[PDB]
Amino acid sequence: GPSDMYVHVGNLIYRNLHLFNSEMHESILVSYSSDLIIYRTNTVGDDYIPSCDCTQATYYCKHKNRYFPITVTSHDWYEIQESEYYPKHIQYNLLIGEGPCEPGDCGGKLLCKHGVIGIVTAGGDNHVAFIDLRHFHCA
Amino acid sequence: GPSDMYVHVGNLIYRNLHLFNSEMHESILVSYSSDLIIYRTNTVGDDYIPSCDCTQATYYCKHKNRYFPITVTSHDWYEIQESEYYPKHIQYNLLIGEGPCEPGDCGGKLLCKHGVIGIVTAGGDNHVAFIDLRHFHCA
Ligand SMILES: *CC(=O)[C@@H](CCSC)NC(=O)[C@@H](C)NC(=O)[C@@H](NC(=O)OCc1ccccc1)C(C)C
Ligand SMILES: *CC(=O)[C@H](CCSC)NC(=O)[C@H](C)NC(=O)[C@H](NC(=O)OCc1ccccc1)C(C)C
Ligand SMILES: [Zn+2]
Ligand SMILES: [Zn+2]
């Protein structure tokens, strides 16, 4: 679902870490260095995470309730500074292009021609960052 | 190294969660149910985790400072008892075979013919449990 702030492939859920409030489960994986939690759920999704290397993409902006086309660049690591909630740490496997960003936009799906490749994790003045989900998925 | 109590593949290191949870928020992956944690490091490792099948293997026992041949049984889960920390919990993605094990033996590598497939996580009456690192890796 285009407006869904999470990624759902099969029985798996890919979701921002701080967007988690729910129950502890056996299948829960957590990447503190990527603000990502992965777990299994009872329902099934139609999302698909490709094993590609695309950069010509598009993503969902929540506070505008619309999709922006975007060209992104892959970063091995990047200094993600400190906001009120969490400190200035290092986040691995990021995607970055220019685009609008405002609080409450995390989970916004980023897609290429093959499927969902990431979700909004942070942004700044006219630049937005995504978790590269391709790294946390098997071909 | 054969006596190294950790798996070190590429820029990633694999350790027991219940022993290295101090720097947890800086880790790149965590599985609370399987007692696994993964950190990044500058150095590059020689270790190799295969995507295979083997049940006939060998593992490093620190308190005897030598290797034991061992035949392991893949459990999807099993519940360990209570020591002087972490009361009787359940653990998932395990390998278990016959072999000596006393406190301080974890990280002891479990190798097959192809490479490393686990580290010691639990030990009891002539039985030692490993984490199935193959369940946490991509071919
Ligand atoms: C879900 C939520 O509320 C968002 C808010 C998005 S609005 C920006 N979560 C966040 O963690 C926000 C507060 N994070 C940040 O603003 C980053 N800022 C940042 O450096 O990103 C800009 C950037 C541009 C290009 C490459 C990398 C980053 C801070 C945590 C530093
Ligand atoms: C993994 C380690 O080496 C450390 C030593 C810490 S020393 C302060 N871990 C443990 O001691 C670990 C948490 N406890 C156990 O492994 C043992 N668990 C148990 O009773 O089950 C034994 C067993 C289970 C399944 C298969 C085979 C054996 C006890 C609690 C010491
Ligand atoms: Zn693609
Ligand atoms: Zn093998």
From Swiss-Prot, chains A, B:
Binding residues annotated for Zn(2+) 1, in chain numbering: C52, C54, C112, H114
Cysteines paired by S-S bonds: none
Signal peptide: none
Residue stretches in coiled coil: none
Catalytic activity, reaction form: Selective cleavage of Tyr-|-Gly bond in the picornavirus polyprotein
Active site positions, chain numbering: H18, D35, C106
Quaternary structure (record): Homodimer.
Function: Cysteine protease that cleaves viral polyprotein and specific host proteins. It is responsible for the autocatalytic cleavage between the P1 and P2 regions, which is the first cleavage occurring in the polyprotein. Also cleaves the host translation initiation factor EIF4G1, in order to shut down the capped cellular mRNA translation. Inhibits the host nucleus-cytoplasm protein and RNA trafficking by cleaving host members of the nuclear pores. Counteracts stress granule formation probably by antagonizing its assembly or promoting its dissassembly.
Protein name: Protease 2A
Originating organism: Human rhinovirus 2 (HRV-2)
Shown chain mapped onto the complete sequence: 851 to 989 of 2150
